[PDB]
């Protein structure tokens, strides 16, 4: 997260870290057994880390649980990033408490100008690289689809939206992929892609979760 702020330990209790001997992507806990992340975050050997603040120190409140299923959307296109969503089933149910909690799925899509919370352990620099120990947070509005398409002509599908700023300085970045965009207590977005990070006129692009609520439901119920 570039241009954000330290969230505070366990203030985003649905935020998870996906770990393969290092933090590689974020995700969101949606019930005791299931995590939503990005399809492009798929790999073998995923350990889900819940209740994290400092990802480099065992502080208390962590739960490390292996992924038992990693389900990429069958129509995920790695060329266009359309359908950039993945479901991870945990080996054992997480213990839910104040510091480890699920986030609600949307009942409807969000509108332009809705203010959302984007969070992660990604790069904090727009130029070069700095990775934080603790979780970072950013408040960011959903942009109009006209403005989103103007920024990225021919590249924004019905399953994507833009959020953030056009003036530069505030954005999600490398290492934040798969993590949450939460608006009015609903998981509306998944950190997906963009042109660089926090660059003028290049807002972040996010998977539009409201389009997948039925798929998520049908997939969990059958697994």
């Amino acid at each position: 997260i570039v241009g954000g702020y330290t969230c505070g330990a366990n203030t985003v209790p649905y935020q998870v870290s996906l770990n393969s001997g290092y933090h590689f992507c974020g995700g969101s806990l949606i019930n005791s057994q299931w995590v939503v992340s990005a399809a492009h975050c798929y790999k073998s050997g995923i350990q889900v880390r819940l209740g994290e603040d400092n990802i480099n120190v065992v502080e208390g409140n962590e739960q490390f649980i292996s992924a038992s299923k990693s389900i990429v959307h069958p129509s995920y296109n790695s060329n266009t990033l359309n359908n950039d969503i993945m479901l991870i089933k945990l080996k054992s149910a997480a213990s839910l408490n104040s510091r480890v909690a699920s986030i609600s799925l949307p009942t409807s899509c969000a509108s332009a100008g809705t203010q959302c919370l984007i969070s992660g352990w990604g790069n904090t620099k727009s130029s070069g690289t700095s990775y934080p120990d603790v979780l970072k947070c950013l408040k960011a509005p959903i942009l109009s689809d006209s403005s989103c398409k103007s920024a990225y002509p021919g590249q924004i599908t019905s399953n994507m939206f833009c959020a953030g700023y056009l003036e530069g300085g505030k954005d999600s970045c490398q290492g934040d992929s798969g993590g949450p965009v939460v608006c009015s207590g609903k998981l509306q977005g998944i950190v997906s892609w963009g042109s660089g990070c926090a660059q003028k006129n290049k807002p972040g692009v996010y998977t539009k979760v409201c389009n997948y609520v039925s798929w998520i439901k049908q997939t969990i119920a059958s697994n």
């Binding site: 290092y22 492009h40 990225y152 999600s172 934040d176 950190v191 892609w193 963009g194």
Partner: peptide, 10 residues
Amino acid sequence: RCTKSXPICF
């Protein structure tokens, strides 16, 4: 344009 992962660029 890149994904925001440990990046996949185009």
